[PDB]
Amino acid sequence: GYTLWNDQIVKDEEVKIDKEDRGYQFGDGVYEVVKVYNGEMFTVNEHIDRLYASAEKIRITIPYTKDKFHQLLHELVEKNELNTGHIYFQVTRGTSPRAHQFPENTVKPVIIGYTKENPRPLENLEKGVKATFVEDIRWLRCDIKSLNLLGAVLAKQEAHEKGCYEAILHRNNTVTEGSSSNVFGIKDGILYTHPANNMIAKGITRDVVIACANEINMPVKEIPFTTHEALKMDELFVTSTTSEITPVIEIDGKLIRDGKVGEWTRKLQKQFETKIPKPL
C-alpha cells in the first residue's frame, strides 16, 4: 500500500522512522482514526478539527492548513483504493537529540498516515458484547488524544484476557470512558454519559450519538455514574469510530437488564445509520 509521510504519498517500504523521533522516545504526538464507508470519509472535518486541537494543547504546530491536510487524506484513500475501513494518522513533535524540553522551533513535525480495509462490526452491533471494570490509572489529561497510550493498552489486555470486548474504566468507582471508546448508560429513556472534561476523550462518535438523541427527542444528561449505578441501568453501550454503537449486554458476569439489546439503543443505532455514507 501507500503511506502518507509528511506531504508525500510514498510506498509503505519507503517510510523510515528515526530513533530520535520524539514520538518514539516520549510518545510526544497526537493521532486520529477516521472511518471510511464505501470510499467516503465519515465526519472527516470533525476529526481533523480534533487533531489540530490535540496538537495545540501540547503545543505542536502542524505545518499544513486544514484544507491541505484534508486533501492529502483524500489522496491517501484514493491511491490505496479504500472501500470500507479506516485511516490512521498521527503527528509527532519531530526528530531531535533526546531532551525532555521542546526542541528549537525549527524542527519539523513528522506526519504518518495509512489505511486498513476493515468491515463494520455487524455481528457486535446486533448481538452486543461483554465488558469488564478496570480501574482508571491514566494521567489527568485524557482530553488530549496523544500517543501516551500505555494505560489503555494494559486495560484492553485485561479485558481481552477475560474474553471481554472492552474495559470500562473508573476513577474511584465513577465510570469515565472505555479504553478506546466512550460509555453511555440509559435508564427510563434518559441517556447518561460522563461530561467532557479532562477525565475523558471527547469522542466524535459520542457527539454524533448525542446529536442523534436530540433528533429523536431522547433526554440527555451529561452526569457521571458509578460502576454500581451502571449495573442498574436499563441499557448500556460504548461508542468509537470503529465500534460505532456497540451494545454492552454483560459486565463481569452480571447481565445488563436481561442481556439483550435494549429499545433505545436500537433507536440510536437507526438514527446513527442515517448519517453514514451509503452511495451506490
Minimum CB separation of residue 138 from ligand PLP in Å reads: 8
Classified as helix, coil or strand, 274 is coil
Which of ligand PLP, a second copy, none binds 206 (CB below 5-8 Å, type-dependent)? ligand PLP
Classified as helix, coil or strand, 72 is helix
Which of ligand PLP, a second copy, none binds 181 (CB below 5-8 Å, type-dependent)? ligand PLP
How far apart are the C-alpha atoms of 268 and 186, rounded to whole Å?
A: 11
Determine contact, residues 256/229, Cβ cutoff 8 Å.
no
How far apart are the C-alpha atoms of 182 and 45, rounded to whole Å?
A: 20
Minimum CB separation of residue 169 from ligand PLP in Å reads: 8
From candidates 1, 6, 9, 25, binder to a second copy by CB under 8 A = 25
From candidates 41, 206, 247, 265, binder to ligand PLP by CB under 6 A = 206
Minimum CB separation of residue 74 from a second copy in Å reads: 20
Task: Verify binding: residue 27, a second copy, rule CB under 8 A.
Answer: yes
Span from 19-27, 121-129, 206-214, 269-277 in contact with a second copy (CB under 8 A): 19-27
Cβ-based nearer residue to ligand PLP, 2 or 165:
165
Burial class (CB in 10 A: 0-12, 13-18, 19+), 145: buried
What 9-14 contacts at long range (C-beta under 8 Å, 24+ apart), as own/partner pairs, is 9/72, 9/75, 9/76, 9/79, 12/114
Cβ-based nearer residue to ligand PLP, 95 or 182:
182
Active site annotation includes 127: no
Burial class (CB in 10 A: 0-12, 13-18, 19+), 160: middle
From candidates 11, 66, 127, 141, binder to a second copy by CB under 8 A = 141
H or E stretch at 131: strand 129-135
Task: Verify binding: residue 182, ligand PLP, rule CB under 6 A.
Answer: yes
Catalytic residue among 35, 130, 145, 156: 145
Strand pairing report for 85-92 and 220-221: unpaired
Minimum CB separation of residue 158 from ligand PLP in Å reads: 15
User: Which residues on adjacent β-strands are paired with residue 95?
Assistant: 21
Which of ligand PLP, a second copy, none binds 26 (CB below 5-8 Å, type-dependent)? a second copy
**Phi, psi values for residue 63, rounded to 5°:** -65, -15
How far apart are the C-alpha atoms of 186 and 169, rounded to whole Å?
A: 18
Cβ-based nearer residue to ligand PLP, 2 or 272:
272
Minimum CB separation of residue 239 from ligand PLP in Å reads: 6
Burial class (CB in 10 A: 0-12, 13-18, 19+), 14: exposed
Does 32 appear as a known binding residue?
A: no
As annotated, the active-site residues are: 145
Q: Residues at the annotated binding site for pyridoxal 5'-phosphate?
A: 50, 177
Residues of this chain that interact with a second copy (CB under 8 A) are: 3, 15-19, 21, 23-28, 31, 58-59, 88, 90, 97-98, 100-102, 112, 114, 116, 137-141, 146-157, 159-160, 179-180
Q: Residues at the annotated binding site for substrate?
A: 31, 98, 100
